[model samples]
Target chain A: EIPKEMLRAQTNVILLNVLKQGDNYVYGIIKQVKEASNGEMELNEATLYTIFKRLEKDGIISSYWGDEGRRKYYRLTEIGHENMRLAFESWSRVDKIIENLEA
Target chain B: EIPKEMLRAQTNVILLNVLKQGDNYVYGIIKQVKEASNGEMELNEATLYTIFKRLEKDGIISSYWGDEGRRKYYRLTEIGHENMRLAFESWSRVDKIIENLEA
Candidate 1:
């Protein structure tokens, strides 16, 4: 079974990156996540939708309807952008440390 | 409750990035993930290890002994690298679309 903490962490990263690009449909977000991670990241339909709901609840991200197929598109709220900025910073710090050690 | 899909997606991103550095212990991966995502990502030990187990099963990553206290070190396999490349490409495609829309 999947671990909870990993799940939470993973969701945040995906959401932040998805919002980084602006608004997008749920399916599109999954596709983008897969592509960006070089097929390393995987999100099933159920899991993706649930995260969308959770993020929506937190006011980090908001959703809207599209002209095509009435698909709901999601974008970052101000809070979401702030969160992503923070996440990026943290990741950068870790990256530097790892690189240093590896070198 | 955390959604499963989001959880799965997040785990892959974290694992790929963690292994990208060569080798690391489980705790280090958790710390790095939190740092990278600016505290947006969260992973508990149970969840982290479980994912590690799954990845190991898939042969995407493998573990070895560390110099300190027998802490197991994990690194990417050739297959893992290939997976990361693919994931990155997928995410990039989606990113372009979202960026274009936002622009």
Candidate 2:
């Protein structure tokens, strides 16, 4: 298993990046992350929703009802996309830092 | 700037990896990380100390007085080294997960 501490760190960016592929409700988001990671990572719904709540509250993502209000869905706002881009860039820099250290 | 949330995630692994290079005190560890990131990252002493306290408590690292007890320095125990290795592996997997997402 990926260390929880490490996984927890990328929680926001991971969810945001997953959303970049398409809009999703909570379950779909969880499935996509598992698939994206080749089934190596699984996010618990409770934890995911907590992060989703914060992301929505911060306006990084927006949510709406789906299937006639039967389900809730989320997508990146313009700010959300920008946030994802910044996060990706930040990860790239940090990855390089770690790479250099390993060298 | 590398986002604090992102940096906060790697704090333990980063500090442990630095100690792998050599034993160092709080200020030295901070300096090493800043230099390692080419001055892009600067860890405030307060945050670094807090992590150091936890790491020491967990036995991932051990510490001793330095310069006649005027300062304190830390190094990895065998367990600490293993923890560092695991953290690195966790990071590599996550990096790939993110990379595949980008593609």
CA lDDT of every candidate: 0.70, 0.78
- Highest lDDT scorer: 2
RMSD of each: 9.0, 4.5
State the lDDT of candidate 1 residue by residue for A45-71, as single tens digits: 888778778988988889888894488
For chain B alone, what TM-score does every candidate structure achieve against the true structure? 0.78, 0.72
DockQ scores for all the models shown? 0.09, 0.31
lDDT (tens digit, per residue) of candidate 2 on A1-103: 4467556766666778778877888999888788879987788999888888888898888988888648888998998888667766766676677677767
- Give the top-scoring candidate (DockQ): 2
